[PDB]
Amino acid sequence: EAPAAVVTGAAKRIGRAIAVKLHQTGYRVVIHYHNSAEAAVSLADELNKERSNTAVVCQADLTNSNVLPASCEEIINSCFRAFGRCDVLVNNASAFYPTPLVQGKTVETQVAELIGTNAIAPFLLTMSFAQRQSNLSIVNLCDAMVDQPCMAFSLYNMGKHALVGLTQSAALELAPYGIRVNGVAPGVSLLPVAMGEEEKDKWRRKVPLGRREASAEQIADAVIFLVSGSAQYITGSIIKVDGGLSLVHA
Amino acid sequence: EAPAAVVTGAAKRIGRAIAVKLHQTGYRVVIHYHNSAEAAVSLADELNKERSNTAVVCQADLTNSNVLPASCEEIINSCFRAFGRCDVLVNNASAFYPTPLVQKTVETQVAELIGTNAIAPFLLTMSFAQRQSNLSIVNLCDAMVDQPCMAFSLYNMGKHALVGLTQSAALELAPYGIRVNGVAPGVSLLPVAMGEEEKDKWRRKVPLGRREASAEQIADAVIFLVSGSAQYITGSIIKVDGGLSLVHA
Amino acid sequence: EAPAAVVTGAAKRIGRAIAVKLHQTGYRVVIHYHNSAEAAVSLADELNKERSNTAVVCQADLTNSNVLPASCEEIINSCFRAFGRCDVLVNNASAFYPTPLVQGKTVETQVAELIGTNAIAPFLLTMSFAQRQKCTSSNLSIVNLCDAMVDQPCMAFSLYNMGKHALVGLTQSAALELAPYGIRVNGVAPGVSLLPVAMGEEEKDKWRRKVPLGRREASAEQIADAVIFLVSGSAQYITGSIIKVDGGLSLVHA
Amino acid sequence: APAAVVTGAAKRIGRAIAVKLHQTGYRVVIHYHNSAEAAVSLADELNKERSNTAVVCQADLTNSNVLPASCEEIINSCFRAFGRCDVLVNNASAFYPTPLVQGKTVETQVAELIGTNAIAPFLLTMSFAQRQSNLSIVNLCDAMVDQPCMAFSLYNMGKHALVGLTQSAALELAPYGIRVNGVAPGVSKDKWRRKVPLGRREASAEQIADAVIFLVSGSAQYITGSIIKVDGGLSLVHA
Numbered sequence: 001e002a003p004a005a006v007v008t009g010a011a012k013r014i015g016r017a018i019a020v021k022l023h024q025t026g027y028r029v030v031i032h033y034h035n036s037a038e039a040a041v042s043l044a045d046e047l048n049k050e051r052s053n054t055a056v057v058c059q060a061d062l063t064n065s066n067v068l069p070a071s072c073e074e075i076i077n078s079c080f081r082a083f084g085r086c087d088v089l090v091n092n093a094s095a096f097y098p099t100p101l102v103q104g105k106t107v108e109t110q111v112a113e114l115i116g117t118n119a120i121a122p123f124l125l126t127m128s129f130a131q132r133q134s135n136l137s138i139v140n141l142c143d144a145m146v147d148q149p150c151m152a153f154s155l156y157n158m159g160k161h162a163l164v165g166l167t168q169s170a171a172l173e174l175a176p177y178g179i180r181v182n183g184v185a186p187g188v189s190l191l192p193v194a195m196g197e198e199e200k201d202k203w204r205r206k207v208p209l210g211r212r213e214a215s216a217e218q219i220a221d222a223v224i225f226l227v228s229g230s231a232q233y234i235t236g237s238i239i240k241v242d243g244g245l246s247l248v249h250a
Numbered sequence: 251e252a253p254a255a256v257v258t259g260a261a262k263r264i265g266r267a268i269a270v271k272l273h274q275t276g277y278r279v280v281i282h283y284h285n286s287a288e289a290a291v292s293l294a295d296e297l298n299k300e301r302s303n304t305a306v307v308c309q310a311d312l313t314n315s316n317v318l319p320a321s322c323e324e325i326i327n328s329c330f331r332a333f334g335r336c337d338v339l340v341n342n343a344s345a346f347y348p349t350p351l352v353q354k355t356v357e358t359q360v361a362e363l364i365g366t367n368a369i370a371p372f373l374l375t376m377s378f379a380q381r382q383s384n385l386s387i388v389n390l391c392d393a394m395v396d397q398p399c400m401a402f403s404l405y406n407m408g409k410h411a412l413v414g415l416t417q418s419a420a421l422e423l424a425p426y427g428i429r430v431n432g433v434a435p436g437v438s439l440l441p442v443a444m445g446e447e448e449k450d451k452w453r454r455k456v457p458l459g460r461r462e463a464s465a466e467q468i469a470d471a472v473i474f475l476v477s478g479s480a481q482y483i484t485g486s487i488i489k490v491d492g493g494l495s496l497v498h499a
Numbered sequence: 500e501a502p503a504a505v506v507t508g509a510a511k512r513i514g515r516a517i518a519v520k521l522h523q524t525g526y527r528v529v530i531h532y533h534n535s536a537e538a539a540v541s542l543a544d545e546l547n548k549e550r551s552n553t554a555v556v557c558q559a560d561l562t563n564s565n566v567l568p569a570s571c572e573e574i575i576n577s578c579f580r581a582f583g584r585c586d587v588l589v590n591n592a593s594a595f596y597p598t599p600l601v602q603g604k605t606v607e608t609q610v611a612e613l614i615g616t617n618a619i620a621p622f623l624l625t626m627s628f629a630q631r632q633k634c635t636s637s638n639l640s641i642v643n644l645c646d647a648m649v650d651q652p653c654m655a656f657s658l659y660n661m662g663k664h665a666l667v668g669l670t671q672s673a674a675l676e677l678a679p680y681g682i683r684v685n686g687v688a689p690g691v692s693l694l695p696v697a698m699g700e701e702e703k704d705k706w707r708r709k710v711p712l713g714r715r716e717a718s719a720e721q722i723a724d725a726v727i728f729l730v731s732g733s734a735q736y737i738t739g740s741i742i743k744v745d746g747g748l749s750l751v752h753a
Numbered sequence: 754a755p756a757a758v759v760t761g762a763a764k765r766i767g768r769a770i771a772v773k774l775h776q777t778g779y780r781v782v783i784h785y786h787n788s789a790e791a792a793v794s795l796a797d798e799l800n801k802e803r804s805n806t807a808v809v810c811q812a813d814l815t816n817s818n819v820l821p822a823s824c825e826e827i828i829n830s831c832f833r834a835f836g837r838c839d840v841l842v843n844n845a846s847a848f849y850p851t852p853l854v855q856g857k858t859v860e861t862q863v864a865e866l867i868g869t870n871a872i873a874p875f876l877l878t879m880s881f882a883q884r885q886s887n888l889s890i891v892n893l894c895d896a897m898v899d900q901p902c903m904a905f906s907l908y909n910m911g912k913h914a915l916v917g918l919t920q921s922a923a924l925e926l927a928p929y930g931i932r933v934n935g936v937a938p939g940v941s942k943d944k945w946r947r948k949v950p951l952g953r954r955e956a957s958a959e960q961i962a963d964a965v966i967f968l969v970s971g972s973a974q975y976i977t978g979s980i981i982k983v984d985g986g987l988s989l990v991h992a
């Protein structure tokens with residue numbers, strides 16, 4: 001019987017590539033999304049055309065609020081209702097924008113979005129995943145540049161640092177239940193389509209390996225390794241997939 | 251002419267020892283407290299007895315909420331109200347208790363553990379910088395942040411976030427001449443609720459002297475980081491842990 | 500045509516498991532050894548019986564000395580002599596024993612063995628590997644066997660620990676410098692895997708009980724699996740990364 | 754009065770560290786390899802302030818069969834002159850590129866970069882501990898150790914090895930009451946200055962010395978195994 005995975009933020013870009021590769025590997029998938037319903041649905045239809053009844057969508061805002069714990073419990077529950085099991089959780093969804101310390105969202109909204117998506121929702125999803133429970137594992141999408149932060153991204157960086165701590169804390173606490181918890185830390189991967197090529201090229205030229213950003217598929221390949229039987233003794237580990245970018249001095 | 255410092259959670263234990271040592275160094279101090287009103291007022295009385303008009307208390311809950319920004323702004327404002335300047339912020343206040351992943355609401359636990367340990371330091375940092383010699387912020391971090399205690403996920407996430415803030419704010423505020431650094435205790439003053447046998451278990455793990463840090467030993471590192479002897483140091487986190495973080499399982 | 504790999508210290512234990520797994524993946528292998536001549540030849544025979552002319556042995560002491568550079572050069576040369584190419588280098592060989600700071604080999608012999616095998620030989624083999632290279636198919640990489648407990652060191656193992664820290668530095672320095680040549684450099688960091696043969700069962704079980712995931716050591720094959728991942732096309736954008744394979748051991752406090 | 758050994762003390766950071774320890778009340782052994790005139794000039798300056806408080810000690814810190822005996826004699830020079838040795842500062846350092854892809858032989862570069870930067874500190878640490886209050890060792894580390902300079906593999910390996918020695922020695926010597934810590938300068942030319950967050954300028958040697966003074970002081974009595982970056986924020990700046 002086929003295993004099942006939840007991927008958050010799976011409608012586009014990296015989470016889409018993760019959902020596709022997990023599906024190619026034999027997993028049934030819950031495609032979580034927030035705003036991108038048309039893209040989430042189009043991915044589910046493509047996957048179900050490949051193998052019937054192997055993909056469902058689940059909508060939820062992962063912003064921190066009074067209701068976030070119920071939302072995260074519902075994402076996990078949707079995997080059990082669709083597929084009768086939940087073997088893999090991939091915490092991929094992420095808000096990313098600057099929050100300068102010195103001078104139309106209020107700062108508490110920015111806190112709820114950046115700390116909720118990057119850290120609190122992963123924690124609540126992790127709680128719900130474990131409470132509901134073979135090769136069980138969680139993969140958190142971290143950031144290879146977490147210790148050389150972008151200027152004016154403090155709340156984003158705090159959320160990603162918190163996710164490192166969750167990855168380590170959850171690996172230790174869930175090891176007795178046989179649940180592994182690991183991370184994949186991209187450097188620069190898919191850049192914004194709207195970003196000018198001159199700016200994209202500034203970033204690409206910083207990468208030692210190939211002077212080019214990672215494809216979403218290269219990020220997905222590390223996720224596939226971590227959930228596989230080839231990683232059965234790996235927990236608490238964060239694999240950078242960054243072409244050497246984090247090793248480059250200013 | 252005397253510089254002024256804010257110390258959060260300064261009524262007792264490590265924050266008290268920091269406020270006392272800054273006051274001894276020449277600083278005027280805002281003693282922030284949440285519940286420990288009698289202890290905060292007693293400390294301000296003791297410091298004012300030594301030099302009049304050099305200490306005030308300021309009450310605030312640093313749990314995350316939609317009014318936490320205004321509370322954090324008010325803490326910094328109280329320093330400018332009392333002393334006309336604010337040269338040093340020490341982010342010391344902290345909630346600490348277990349939050350098991352497998353069986354207060356969980357959103358209250360998030361508000362308290364992430365709010366005190368990370369969001370309030372962030373908002374206090376924003377207010378400190380915006381409201382602006384030798385300006386600096388010192389965050390009390392945790393030397394054991396990468397060897398977490400079992401069932402302390404949300405606490406550990408908050409302290410990891412505080413490392414991120416220390417580094418991000420160091421980078422961003424360097425052009426304003428504000429340095430941002432951390433002091434990471436291992437085991438210092440053990441929780442009041444702790445039994446004697448458990449206290450001794452933790453003392454025996456420490457390589458250097460088989461004992462916990464005094465609060466004054468933690469305060470000494472804070473003093474160094476705010477001093478002119480640390481003027482080229484920013485983004486650094488000094489472990490004051492007697493070697494504890496280097497001991498394997 | 501099949502790619503070829505050098506594995507150092509490959510006669511037994513983890514290095515043997517890595518050579519076997521690379522062989523099963525389709526590589527031709529140089530089985531480097533120092534003292535374990537019988538075990539090396541027995542392994543090369545087993546692999547040659549599976550597929551003809553796909554394994555050779557290569558003997559070398561990797562202790563530091565003025566001839567270590569020539570010895571490392573000759574290991575790499577042996578892969579090209581046997582197989583016409585050298586696609587992967589796995590730096591696995593390692594000396595491991597205590598060197599207490601406060602009170603038999605001289606201290607300079609201990610330096611030569613612990614820093615030579617764990618750091619200088621990997622450096623020289625990396626130089627010789629890269630120099631011997633100098634388009635749609637190439638997948639060149641180096642994997643260094645590191646140590647997940649490098650920052651929580653064992654009491655009285657200073658020189659061993661300095662060697663493994665040096666190897667982290669080489670991994671990151673070589674990843675940066677060789678990236679322009681298309682050579683990726685990564686590490687695999689066991690926690691406790693195959694316990695030293697010298698150890699009694701009680702002492703082995705003390706270590707087993709510390710591991711969060713399963714309260715047991717990693718099998719040699721589990722270590723080799725991470726090596727296979729890093730040399731594979733599934734790791735084509737990964738360089739300078741060190742993957743812990745430690746069942747959570749490095750996360751456990753005192 | 755306590756006594757300190759400072760290696761590579763004739764110039765630059767090591768000189769500033771010797772001056773500041775001397776100003777704090779230490780007697781000092783000024784180690785040198787080639788800079789005898791400069792070492793003696795410093796000893797003359799310190800001894801003019803306080804008589805018989807500064808001596809010099811020649812040694813090559815390149816790894817060789819005789820390095821252990823040389824390192825033992827540096828520590829013994831401290832005990833000879835002053836009757837005690839409270840502080841060891843491992844400051845001496847060789848620094849140059851060793852490209853992996855192509856006139857010292859590579860094994861000479863190993864002996865100099867790994868020997869001066871890591872093996873000499875290890876042997877000096879052994880001799881210091883064997884010969885044994887506020888005892889401590891301070892190792893000059895590198896704040897850029899995990900974002901290495903291109904083509905500096907052997908230098909970087911040596912500085913990584915020095916982080917391992919700092920941590921291993923802190924653990925092993927804690928029971929002896931010997932603390933072991935590091936100070937990691939960043940940059941201590943205008944291209945480099947411009948990337949530094951704090952003031953777009955390099956660290957004075959005196960700023961490095963200030964962190965050493967803190968770590969050997971009674972204000973750091975609970976601190977061991979810690980490496981303090983003194984780099985103006987540079988290590989936090991992305992490429």
Ligand SMILES: NC(=O)c1ccc[n+]([C@@H]2O[C@H](COP(=O)([O-])OP(=O)(O)OC[C@H]3O[C@@H](n4cnc5c(N)ncnc54)[C@H](OP(=O)(O)O)[C@@H]3O)[C@@H](O)[C@H]2O)c1
Nearest residue numbers: 009013014033034035036061062063092093094141188189
């Ligand atoms: N791209 C890179 O270079 C890079 C670099 C370092 C780390 N990473 C990490 O890798 C992961 C994937 O990166 P990516 O570039 O693919 O991410 P992305 O496009 O920025 O975001 C992924 C998805 O996150 C979901 N998300 C955002 N805010 C949300 C909210 N409030 N509630 C629920 N879901 C929300 C969105 O879903 P909808 O579209 O459905 O609203 C979005 O499509 C992220 O965790 C990111 O931090 C990426």
Ligand SMILES: NC(=O)c1ccc[n+]([C@@H]2O[C@H](COP(=O)([O-])OP(=O)(O)OC[C@H]3O[C@@H](n4cnc5c(N)ncnc54)[C@H](OP(=O)(O)O)[C@@H]3O)[C@@H](O)[C@H]2O)c1
Nearest residue numbers: 259263264283284285286311312313342343344390437438
């Ligand atoms: N003690 C140790 O071993 C140790 C080890 C590692 C790190 N640290 C760090 O060092 C710092 C000081 O440690 P400590 O043991 O002295 O701390 P603590 O006694 O646990 O707490 C410090 C103070 O924080 C304040 N606080 C707690 N919740 C708050 C809230 N919701 N709003 C506002 N203030 C609140 C309390 O003030 P009131 O009393 O006024 O309510 C409390 O007295 C902390 O950041 C801690 O994480 C300590």
Ligand SMILES: NC(=O)c1ccc[n+]([C@@H]2O[C@H](COP(=O)([O-])OP(=O)(O)OC[C@H]3O[C@@H](n4cnc5c(N)ncnc54)[C@H](OP(=O)(O)O)[C@@H]3O)[C@@H](O)[C@H]2O)c1
Nearest residue numbers: 508512513532533534535560561562591592593644691692
């Ligand atoms: N085993 C573990 O739990 C563990 C834990 C952490 C890290 N690691 C790392 O993983 C790697 C493999 O571990 P292992 O236990 O399989 O290693 P090991 O059995 O201790 O040693 C592997 C091989 O190293 C070779 N070697 C030793 N000194 C040498 C010298 N002077 N010249 C040339 N070769 C020399 C030996 O070859 P001959 O037998 O031919 O003489 C030996 O069989 C090592 O790098 C180790 O540091 C292992």
Ligand SMILES: NC(=O)c1ccc[n+]([C@@H]2O[C@H](COP(=O)([O-])OP(=O)(O)OC[C@H]3O[C@@H](n4cnc5c(N)ncnc54)[C@H](OP(=O)(O)O)[C@@H]3O)[C@@H](O)[C@H]2O)c1
Nearest residue numbers: 761765766785786787788813814815845846893938940941
């Ligand atoms: N300058 C910086 O920006 C910077 C940055 C990062 C780290 N650091 C570290 O901080 C420390 C001091 O830096 P610095 O710039 O003042 O050092 P430096 O001038 O490069 O060298 C310090 C002294 O080391 C001695 N030395 C070199 N090779 C030796 C050998 N084979 N035997 C014995 N002594 C030898 C030399 O003494 P003689 O002159 O007597 O021959 C030299 O004057 C070093 O550990 C360095 O790696 C410095």
Ligand SMILES: COC(=O)C1CCN(C(=O)c2ccc(CNC(=O)c3ccc4nc(N)sc4c3)cc2)CC1
Nearest residue numbers: 593594595646653690691693694695697698699706
């Ligand atoms: C008779 O007992 C022995 O086997 C001796 C060697 C191992 N030993 C230990 O104290 C010790 C330290 C750490 C461990 C856990 N680490 C490993 O087993 C380990 C770690 C690194 C490593 N590198 C190699 N080349 S083999 C190797 C093994 C096990 C034993 C001293 C006594």
